[PDB]
Amino acid sequence: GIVEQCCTSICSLYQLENYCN
């Protein structure tokens, strides 16, 4: 999920917005 995906490679704001709401 977010952590595997964003703590390995840099999530941009756009990718991060995916995990809202």
Partner 1 sequence: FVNQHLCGSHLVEALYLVCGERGFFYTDKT
Binding interface with partner 1 (CB under 8 A): 1-4, 6-13, 16-17, 19-21
Give least dist CB 1 to ligand CRS, A: 7
DSSP secondary structure letters along the chain: -HHHHHHHSPPPHHHHHTT--
- Which of residues 10 and 14 has its CB atom nearest to ligand CRS in the complex? 10
Specify the DSSP class assigned to residue 12. Answer: P
Q: Which residue has the tokens 């995916």?
A: 18
For residues 7 and 14, which CB has a smaller minimum distance to ligand CRS in the complex?
7
Instruction: Look at the block and give the residue holding tokens 């704001």.
Output: 13
CB of 14: closest distance to partner 1 in angstroms?
A: 9
